[PDB]
From a paper:
Plasmid-encoded bacterial [name] dihydrofolate reductase ([name]) catalyzes the same reaction as the chromosomal counterpart but is highly resistant to the widely used antibiotic Trimethoprim (TMP) unlike the chromosomal enzyme. Of special interest is [name] [name], a type II R-plasmid encoded [name] that is distinct from the bacterial- and mammalian- chromosomal DHFRs in sequence, structure, catalytic, and inhibitory mechanisms. The active site of [name] [name] is a promiscuous binding surface as evidenced by the binding of, NADPH and DHF for catalysis, a-NADH as an alternative cofactor, and novobiocin (Ki = 70 µM) and Congo red (Ki = 2 µM) as inhibitors that do not resemble either NADPH or folate.
The structure of [name] mutant of [name] [name] complexed with a non-specific inhibitor Congo red (CGR) has been determined at 1.15 Å resolution. CGR does not utilize its twofold axis to align with any of the three crystallographic twofold axes of the tetrameric protein instead, it binds like the asymmetrical folate and NADP+ at any one of the four symmetry-related positions in the active site pore. The naphthalene moiety with exocyclic sulphonate ion and amino group, interacts with residues 66–68 from all four protomers via metal-based ionic, van der Waals, stacking, and hydrogen bonding interactions. Amino acid residues Val66, His67, and Ile68, with their symmetry-related partners form the immediate vicinity of the bound sulphonated naphthalene. The exocyclic amino group of the naphthalene ring is involved in water-mediated interactions with subunit D. The aromatic naphthalene ring forms a C-H···O interaction with a water molecule that is H-bonded with the carbonyl oxygen of Val66 of subunit C. The naphthalene ring has stacking interactions with a pair of imidazole rings from symmetry related His67 residues. In striking contrast to bisbenzimidazole inhibitors, Congo red does not use its symmetry for binding and the sulphonate does not interact with Lys32 or YTT cluster.
Author numbering:
A (entry chain A), B (entry chain A), C (entry chain A), D (entry chain A): 21 to 78
Amino acid sequence: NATFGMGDRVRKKSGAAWQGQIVGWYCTNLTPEGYAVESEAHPGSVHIYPVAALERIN
Amino acid sequence: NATFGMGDRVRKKSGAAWQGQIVGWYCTNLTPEGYAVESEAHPGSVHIYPVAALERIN
Amino acid sequence: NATFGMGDRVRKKSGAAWQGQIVGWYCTNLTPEGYAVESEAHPGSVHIYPVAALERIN
Amino acid sequence: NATFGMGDRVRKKSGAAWQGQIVGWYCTNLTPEGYAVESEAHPGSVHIYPVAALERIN
Ligand code: NA
Ligand code: NA
């Protein structure tokens, strides 16, 4: 039931910015659906965010 | 061919410390096999590391 | 007018946990008063947070 | 004796990329001279690095 798949382009909706491709997944009690996103601006740098923080873009 | 699975207890081998359970996975060109690890000391806090940075513990 | 000083013991108030000593400072438009905190559980690992996310403890 | 000052434009020398302005400082035993850098590509997002990881650019 994953919202995003590998390679989707996503951005953070608000606050500190982040944008790039989905490169992984994680799950905790605090964040039952989380994603790893590699920056499209800073190759190799990856952030993890809850699904609710992210939106898919073209 | 994953080295670790969900729930394995791992620690960072050197440098800044980190220890807890595997909670996810990611893959980039820089890090073709990476893991998300939730701290066992700081619930909810998650770091991502390359496989080579981590070792499984009891 | 800094809320915390070097060496203060602080914790994150909510969400993902973090606890340890103040080891630095930063300032952005999003976070005009921010602090670096070295984990007391994971030596060497440092997170940065806005002041509003942190509280001083004994 | 700080290598960089607030507002210097810096980049990470190798590995995962990062580039933007110095916005803060930190010091630990592992990293006796560290800096906070706000991405110029992703406003509001800040990483911390040891001085040896960074170089000043125009
Ligand atoms: Na991380
Ligand atoms: Na950082």
